[PDB]
Design a protein around this ligand. Structure first.
Ligand SMILES: Cc1ncc(COP(=O)(O)O)c(/C=N/[C@H](C)P(=O)(O)O)c1O
Ligand SMILES: Cc1ncc(COP(=O)(O)O)c(/C=N/[C@H](C)P(=O)(O)O)c1O
Lengths: 380, 380
């Protein structure tokens, strides 16, 4: 694959392999690892990360909705995939044919699907309980038993799993976590029998309480080398390796005289004779306007973004005359300086999760494996 | 195509047609309209908008970088295309061969392109001047003459046009605007002969001063039915039709009891007996976390987004117990109420330009033309 703009993101698959393999070591051998690669693998490349995670010890994959699961199938992934979110009852037949497990949390969904499907492929369901997150999931005993009954009666409906999700597993204080875990324990007792897969842990819960994961963990954010939250950074068992980095290059360099203005609204004014550089990355690339008071790295040094950020490009103050084509690092390391996703996240006033997901389709992903380029993925 | 999740964007091509046709009527017969279609047509869909704009009176298209132009060419667009940003000297042959015009602003670029390209296709260049935007462009007299000379000197290099871009055309205060306009008229005198295409106006300048735009207008934001700024709004010659809308559907509804918490960090607590709905859209779709206290439309009413916004889902407080499947409008009209892109931008503390651009590849675009569904574009 090829690209024609000097702006690209690099995904270190070696880092991903290490993050997942260290988990495989940490957890009891009888506990499976389900790698969650929804949202195009948190913006890292769905199939590339999936292949890698499976190599390091993961046995299943998780995605947000049906289209994401179907896309993985079309790209050659044959491992089991669980759809974590909602789906259309009418699509049960397509999920069954492609061997995609579904999440179920209401009986009227199953009523509707029983009438539209009748073999020959079995559909594997994972019953979702709401133990305190308030998103999706059952909350009553009568509804839980109704769902199980409706699944029990249809010869092609199978209950493969049962799970819940934590809302504060990344908080040092474990009060709410404890309530949720205990509630899950109580709700499990409402089932006539234990299905083969019982899961509840995300990255934070599995890294902190490996022994309280039952038989399968849904490993996300940490797989990409990002800490669930800064609070538990010191509580992590093994060092995480960040996999994402973003780069660009100077396409224009010029010296301004005192008084000249830069960018939209003419917000910035040079005061001395200064060198301004232009890089081909803007907010349509996910480098949002709120980042106008942040900085990038040029020739091992910090350089401030100057003026307002544009849709496809932005300006920065240079230390002096640098050659056109000089590499600029938005996220990553250059010399002794470094800009991590958490730094960007702080500035955007969000969590690290949102940063790589916002780096758009417009930006090419270059995959590294064994310290060498494996492939380039240019969405457009 | 088709999608398997109930979240989708709607693009009204009839609105886009009208926005362009009105300008076509407002402008002189000699003046061309170059529809700016970069960033996937501001998140609206590149081919669909490019095609509609051409039908409405536009004669040319403008893109941000080479990959965007090649993408249009591969989807059957055969109209002229100008790359507004930078490109590599080594890609000049690719651009020539695909009939793509390139922006030039440095003499060393040409010196390099000359050594690499010898023929046989002619490459049309548009000389960018920097009048006070500080982004891209030539600033001095002898740099301009050196570029012109290098072009004149090459048998396959053609200077088809030259242009500038205004930094404050949307500002009521026209003082910096007139400075740039004056600077441009002056820099035009460094050229021996006035090229066939001279352009300078974006949506703001073309709609405000349609006669002082020379023979080509670069039309962007206004084509999508969005005002360049809130201040310019009552100065525009005709009403703009908003073309982008965003919808989803309730995939879960539940009644929470007081004290119960919702979403990450359990930052929302139900105080009364509230019905809570879960919709399948989140920050990985461009519906950023910052929109947490924003109001969406459900059954003709404003309903607040309660608790933290997740990667693929978020929660809202319902007026009452509505059935699963109920349409929720994030951007658009629901009977009596309307949420415009300007409303979302206000909450995100940004400009309308950024909003549709951020709605990701994950969200399908449904196109309407002649009041009928025309096409469904699903990126994954
Ligand atoms: C049901 C489920 N299991 C596992 C994970 C993996 O969690 P993590 O990346 O912290 O290890 C997630 C992540 N989701 C995002 C965090 P969101 O809720 O925003 O869709 C999840 O929703
Ligand atoms: C050179 C050039 N000409 C024309 C336009 C059309 O402008 P408009 O949408 O106001 O009609 C733009 C838009 N670009 C965004 C405004 P950015 O500069 O942020 O990439 C442009 O960059």
């Amino acid at each position: 694959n090829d690209f024609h703009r000097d702006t690209w993101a690099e995904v270190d698959l070696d880092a991903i392999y290490d993050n997942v393999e260290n988990l495989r070591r940490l957890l009891p051998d009888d506990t499976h690892i389900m790698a969650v690669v929804k949202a195009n693998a948190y913006g890292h490349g769905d199939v590339q990360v999936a292949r890698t995670a499976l190599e390091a010890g993961a046995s299943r994959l998780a995605v947000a909705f049906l289209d994401e699961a179907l896309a993985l199938r079309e790209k050659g992934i044959e491992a089991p995939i669980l759809v974590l979110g909602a789906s259309r009852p009418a699509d049960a037949a397509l999920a069954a044919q492609q061997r995609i497990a579904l999440t179920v949390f209401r009986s009227d969904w199953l009523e509707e699907a029983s009438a539209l499907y009748s073999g020959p492929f079995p559909i594997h369901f994972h019953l979702k309980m709401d133990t305190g997150m308030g998103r999706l999931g059952v909350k009553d005993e009568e509804e839980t038993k109704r769902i199980v009954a409706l699944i029990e009666r249809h010869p092609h409906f199978v209950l493969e799993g049962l799970y819940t999700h934590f809302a504060t597993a990344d908080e040092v204080n474990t009060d709410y976590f404890s309530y949720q875990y205990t509630r899950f324990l109580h709700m499990l007792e409402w089932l006539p029998s234990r299905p083969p897969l019982v899961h509840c842990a995300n990255s934070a819960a599995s890294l902190r309480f490996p022994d309280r994961t039952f038989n399968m963990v849904r490993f996300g954010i940490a797989m990409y080398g990002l800490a669930p939250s800064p609070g538990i950074k010191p509580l992590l068992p093994y060092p995480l390796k960040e996999a994402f980095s973003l780069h660009s290059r100077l396409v224009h360099v010029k010296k301004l005289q005192p008084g000249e203005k830069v960018s939209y609204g003419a917000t910035y004014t040079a005061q001395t004779e200064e060198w301004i550089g232009t890089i081909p990355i803007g907010y349509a690339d996910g480098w949002l306007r709120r980042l106008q008071h942040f900085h990038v790295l040029v020739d091992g040094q910090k350089a401030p973004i100057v003026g307002r950020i544009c849709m496809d490009q932005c300006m920065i103050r240079l230390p002096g005359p640098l050659p056109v084509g000089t590499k600029v690092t938005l996220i990553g390391r250059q010399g002794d300086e470094v800009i991590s996703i958490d730094d960007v996240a702080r500035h955007l006033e969000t969590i690290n999760y949102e940063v790589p997901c916002t780096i758009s389709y417009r930006v090419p992903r270059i995959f590294f494996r064994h310290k060498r380029i494996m492939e380039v993925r240019n969405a457009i």
